[PDB]
């Protein structure tokens with residue numbers, strides 16, 4: 614039995630991705646959520662629409678929670694076909710929380726939590742599997758505002774995961790020390806975490822090509838657009854159903870497709886990083 618899984622599945626874009634996968638994906642779809650009550654309520658919402666998602670708890674900030682999910686997927690399915698890393702957090706527009714606190718809080722979940730899910734679950738991905746990391750067009754605004762030296766580092770085709778980890782930790786520590794402008798950083802803390810998600814996706818796509826050549830796995834970062842969810846607000850352009858389109862596209866690329874792979878994709882089109 615084939616299996617697809619979405620992180621941060623109880624609301625927002627992640628719930629919409631789950632719904633579309635329940636309609637389209639040939640196999641089981643696992644809705645995950647950090648809070649069991651909110652995950653179960655979202656499964657009941659989808660069951661009221663005629664769909665049958667499975668549920669498993671997952672808090673991407675708890676490595677034990679990630680490992681419990683890893684063990685469940687190995688036991689029940691022998692691995693994983695589709696992984697959508699959707700979970701993320703942000704501060705509201707004009708939120709008065711100090712910039713160094715926004716940096717530490719956003720970085721912990723959006724970069725290091727997503728990275729731990731990839732560390733634990735990438736080895737489970739089966740041939741013809743797809744992995745989708747939900748990034749944001751805020752990563753482009755952040756990248757363009759970096760110093761030219763940071764832009765070169767973040768665009769490099771040879772950067773390692775450990776080098777990227779050093780940069781993400783350096784951003785957080787530079788905000789605490791009050792030196793992030795002199796050190797070449799932009800001034801959106803969420804946007805730097807999404808630079809991290811985009812570059813992590815590039816590194817992981819290169820690793821899959823080098824080490825799993827022939828297994829036909831495709832891994833991409835994506836931008837869902839501005840979507841009416843609790844992260845954003847009712848002015849946002851897209852419904853959750855519309856925001857889900859590009860992630861669903863990337864999750865369901867036909868077997869044997871040669872790409873996109875390692876791309877940063879918006880409205881189903883590759884953007885130059």
Ligand SMILES: NC(=O)c1ccc[n+]([C@@H]2O[C@H](COP(=O)([O-])OP(=O)(O)OC[C@H]3O[C@@H](n4cnc5c(N)ncnc54)[C@H](OP(=O)(O)O)[C@@H]3O)[C@@H](O)[C@H]2O)c1
Nearest residue numbers: 621625626647672673699700701749839840842843844845
């Ligand atoms: N305009 C937009 O909405 C927009 C634009 C570009 C990119 N994005 C990206 O789209 C993705 C979905 O965001 P959204 O707009 O749908 O936001 P949302 O409505 O706030 O949903 C975020 C989801 O992530 C979950 N989450 C947060 N921290 C988690 C953790 N530690 N472990 C597991 N799940 C966690 C939330 O769970 P709880 O219910 O427990 O909080 C919720 O299920 C995020 O990566 C976001 O950066 C959004």
Ligand SMILES: O=C(O)CNC(=O)[C@@H]1CSCN2CN1C(=O)CC[C@H]2C(=O)O
Nearest residue numbers: 703704705706707749750751803844845
């Ligand atoms: O206007 C600003 O500089 C501050 N606010 C934001 O960028 C705002 C925080 S929520 C995270 N993202 C960017 N913001 C949004 O409202 C759009 C949703 C989200 C995104 O585009 O990724």
Ligand SMILES: [Cl-]
Nearest residue numbers: 750836837838
């Ligand atoms: Cl976006």
